Design a protein around this ligand. Structure first.
Ligand SMILES: [Cl-]
Lengths: 15, 139
């Protein structure tokens, strides 16, 4: 799942 | 058709998408208007959804460009809402196999849109249906 979608941390810096 | 037209158009669009992204990112970093994606997203989306072009678009890594267009701008703001909506729609339209999702990393930005609390309800719902749809194709 994370291979396709990541951990959800990749763009967090945005928030 | 002349047999070369499909690949020529597909190659040309990849270059155009990269050029627009680079120009908007540089303008954004320079604190200048960066409206290249805004102005071109509709005509570029017509190209991206063309069935005759799908295999060559996908084969040449167009997903990398679609990811870049969806990614945060250099000041960390997100691309304008019409871009987010039109490109999610493009993605829903394309027949994308799991390996292309893997190599492109486009799932990561779509996943982010799905959990981003600052995102509009409609965009967040579209991203979520895309994550689910892709997850069903993966397994
Ligand atoms: Cl933008």
């Amino acid at each position: 799942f994370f291979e396709i979608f990541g951990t959800g941390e990749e763009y967090r810096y945005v928030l | 058709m002349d047999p070369g037209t499909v690949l020529e158009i597909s190659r040309s669009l990849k270059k155009r998408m990269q050029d627009i992204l680079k120009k908007d990112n540089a303008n954004n970093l320079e604190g200048r208007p960066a409206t290249g994606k805004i102005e071109n997203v509709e005509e570029i989306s017509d190209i991206l959804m063309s069935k005759a072009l799908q295999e060559s678009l996908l084969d040449e890594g167009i997903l990398d460009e679609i990811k870049g267009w969806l990614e945060p701008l250099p000041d960390k703001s997100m691309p304008n809402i019409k871009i987010r909506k039109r490109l999610l729609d493009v993605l829903k339209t394309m027949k994308i196999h799991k390996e292309h999702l893997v190599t492109s990393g486009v799932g990561k930005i779509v996943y982010f849109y799905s959990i981003n609390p600052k995102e509009s309800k409609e965009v967040r719902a579209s991203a979520k249906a895309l994550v689910q749809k892709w997850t069903n194709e993966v397994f």
